[PDB]
Design a protein around this ligand. Structure first.
Ligand SMILES: CN1CCN(c2ccc(NC(=O)c3ccc(C#N)o3)c(N3CCCCC3)c2)CC1
Length: 281
């Protein structure tokens, strides 16, 4: 079943948009459950201009799936907008299958960007980290838990500005080694301890994951816990306080951030607003 995991701790027709003003383009990414393509929206917004957007849609398998896409539409529509989230822009719930229109981020996902860049400056890596912390500060102010914070789940748009989102619809998580077949598909290398043992998720759980994400950014995109398998010995490791060593490109204070994010006690971790402030230095 398709499903996003943004959890807050029905539809406003003001978002509706005619699909006849929606001109499909190239497929950006396809999972088994649906796909996201790029398009052009004529008359979408106050400006009634032409903006290039991205449309999430399901395949042909229905209908508790259609329902999931709707629920995602409603959550996004409630959280409100923010300069560092991939924003809802509109939708098509009539005259055909549900289309969820969102912002198009031209430079693609952060992880790939980092990897074909192994030129960036350390000031760029700082901009990415800060921008994402600001998007995450926003989510938690809305009492929203992301539950899948990772570099793959950050996009870069104009001016290489970072926007966080959930893009599980457009890739194959069922066949992705970073997501474990526990049953649910869980990104265990990014998950805080309490999420792995007590199935507890909170805003501070996200902070942990943002720590691992920091590590991805300043290691220019290595897989976390390099050469270490997900299994019983692994759970004992992170439970016992094991932490990844400082990335080559990380400054000393940035690695301070990660270590704080990886506090074993959830309440010892910094909040996203605290993080945002130390990042602006
Ligand atoms: C030279 N290329 C590299 C990257 N690329 C690219 C552009 C945009 C996106 N995605 C999105 O804008 C977007 C917004 C919301 C969602 C969703 N779901 O996707 C991407 N990807 C494609 C699939 C993973 C998400 C980012 C690549 C196209 C060609």
């Amino acid at each position: 079943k398709y499903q996003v995991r943004w959890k807050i701790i029905p539809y406003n027709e003001k978002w509706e948009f005619p699909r006849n003003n929606l001109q499909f383009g190239k497929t950006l990414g396809a999972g088994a459950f649906g796909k996201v393509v790029e398009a052009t929206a004529f008359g979408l917004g106050k400006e009634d201009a032409v903006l290039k957007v991205a449309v999430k849609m399901l395949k042909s398998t229905a209908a508790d799936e259609k329902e999931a896409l709707m629920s995602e539409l409603k959550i996004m529509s409630h959280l409100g907008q923010h300069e560092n989230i991939v924003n809802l822009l509109g939708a098509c719930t009539h005259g055909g299958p549900v289309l969820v229109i969102t912002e198009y981020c031209c430079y693609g996902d952060l992880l790939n960007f980092l990897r074909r860049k192994r030129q960036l400056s350390s000031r760029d890596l700082l901009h990415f980290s800060s921008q994402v912390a600001q998007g995450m500060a926003f989510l938690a102010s809305k009492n929203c838990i992301h539950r899948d914070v990772a570099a793959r789940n950050v996009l870069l748009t104009n001016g290489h500005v970072a926007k966080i989102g959930d893009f599980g619809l457009a890739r194959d998580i069922m066949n992705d080694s970073n997501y474990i077949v526990k049953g649910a598909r869980l990104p265990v290398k990014w998950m805080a301890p309490e999420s792995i043992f007590d199935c507890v998720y909170t805003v501070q759980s996200d902070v942990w994951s943002y720590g691992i994400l920091l590590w991805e950014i300043f290691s220019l995109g290595l897989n976390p816990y390099p050469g270490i398998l997900v299994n019983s010995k692994f759970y004992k490791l992170v439970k016992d306080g094991y932490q990844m060593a400082q990335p080559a490109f990380a400054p000393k204070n940035i690695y301070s951030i990660m270590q704080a994010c990886w506090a074993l006690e959830p309440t010892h971790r910094p909040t996203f607003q605290q993080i945002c402030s130390f990042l602006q230095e």
